[PDB]
Enzyme design. Structure first.
Site, short mmCIF file in Angstrom:
data_model
loop_
_atom_site.label_atom_id
_atom_site.label_comp_id
_atom_site.label_asym_id
_atom_site.label_seq_id
_atom_site.Cartn_x
_atom_site.Cartn_y
_atom_site.Cartn_z
N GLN A 19 46.51 94.10 86.20
CA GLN A 19 46.06 93.19 85.18
C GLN A 19 47.20 92.40 84.55
O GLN A 19 46.94 91.39 83.90
CB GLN A 19 45.30 93.97 84.11
CG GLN A 19 46.18 94.91 83.32
CD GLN A 19 45.40 95.78 82.38
OE1 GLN A 19 44.87 96.82 82.79
NE2 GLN A 19 45.35 95.41 81.11
N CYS A 25 41.72 94.81 80.90
CA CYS A 25 41.31 96.01 81.64
C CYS A 25 39.80 96.21 81.62
O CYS A 25 39.25 96.79 82.56
CB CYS A 25 41.99 97.24 81.06
SG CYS A 25 41.77 97.32 79.27
N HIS A 159 41.88 101.68 76.58
CA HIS A 159 42.17 101.17 77.91
C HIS A 159 41.00 101.53 78.79
O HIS A 159 40.66 102.71 78.90
CB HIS A 159 43.44 101.79 78.48
CG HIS A 159 43.89 101.19 79.76
ND1 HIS A 159 44.06 99.83 79.93
CD2 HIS A 159 44.18 101.76 80.96
CE1 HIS A 159 44.46 99.59 81.16
NE2 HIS A 159 44.54 100.74 81.81
N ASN A 175 43.25 102.89 88.11
CA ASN A 175 43.83 102.12 87.02
C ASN A 175 44.05 100.69 87.51
O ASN A 175 43.92 100.37 88.69
CB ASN A 175 45.14 102.76 86.57
CG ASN A 175 45.55 102.35 85.18
OD1 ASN A 175 44.84 101.60 84.50
ND2 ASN A 175 46.70 102.85 84.73
#
Ligand SMILES: *[C@@H](C(=O)O)[C@H](O)C(=O)N[C@H](C(=O)NCCCCCCCCN)C1CCC1
Length: 212
Positions: A19, A25, A159, A175
């Site tokens: 990102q 995110c 997050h 992630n």
């Protein structure tokens, strides 16, 4: 549900993304979950546009953060373009879904996992990748290199990421910090600790798209 799930081995997970500096995110997490359900239901793995959700989910706030739930709501109401049609720019721009032709995929809704409930989240992961949130601000999470991550971390979630599997003692997380973080971009977060919040608040707020 089985002892192990890994949607990567089922071919339902696209390569790990980065990102960048943008607080996007929520859109990356949402897109991971869409790519997964489109593969599960149609047999095709495609990459979808984080940038489209970033620009067009007016409930969210572009690079100042946002809501995976509102991004999936946007994909179920309108749709989403392929990533190649609407590539990631790392900055919010004006919504260009109109100028990019017909949507590539569309879902039929969004559902939330019962929060603060490990079995409910595992149950959702067994069916499909799930958008989940966690506290990533801690240095231990930031500096994670591998293994089953147990913290230290609090439950102040900040997050959004995507759960794409689990094992007896962990949940497998894609992630959006590039392939150089963690275990080739993934983290295994300890589960089964009896903490209703989850390690790093992992059970706080979990959503997945529904597609008939
Ligand atoms: C996640 C990232 O690291 O990219 C990103 O910060 C995020 O979306 N987090 C997110 C969140 O905090 N959402 C609400 C942001 C509203 C603020 C913008 C407008 C100014 C308000 N003072 C949630 C999902 C993960 C925690």
């Amino acid at each position: 549900i089985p002892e192990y799930v890994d949607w990567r081995q089922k071919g339902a997970v696209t390569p790990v993304k980065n990102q960048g500096s943008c607080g996007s995110c929520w859109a990356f997490s949402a897109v991971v979950t869409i790519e997964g359900i489109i593969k599960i239901r149609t047999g095709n793995l495609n990459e979808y546009s984080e940038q489209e959700l970033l620009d067009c989910d007016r409930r969210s706030y572009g690079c100042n953060g946002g809501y995976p739930w509102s991004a999936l709501q946007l994909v179920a109401q309108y749709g989403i373009h392929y990533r190649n049609t609407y590539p990631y720019e790392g900055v919010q721009r004006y919504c260009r879904s109109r100028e990019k032709g017909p949507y590539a995929a569309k879902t039929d809704g969004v559902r939330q996992v019962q929060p603060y409930n490990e079995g409910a989240l595992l149950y959702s992961i067994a069916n499909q990748p799930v958008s989940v949130v966690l506290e990533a601000a801690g240095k231990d999470f930031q500096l994670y290199r591998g293994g089953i991550f147990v913290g230290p971390c609090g439950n102040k979630v900040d997050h959004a990421v995507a759960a794409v599997g689990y094992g007896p003692n962990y949940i497998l997380i894609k992630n959006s910090w590039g392939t150089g973080w963690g275990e080739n971009g993934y983290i295994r977060i300890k589960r089964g600790t009896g903490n209703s919040y989850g390690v790093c608040g992992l059970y706080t707020s979990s959503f997945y798209p529904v597609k008939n």
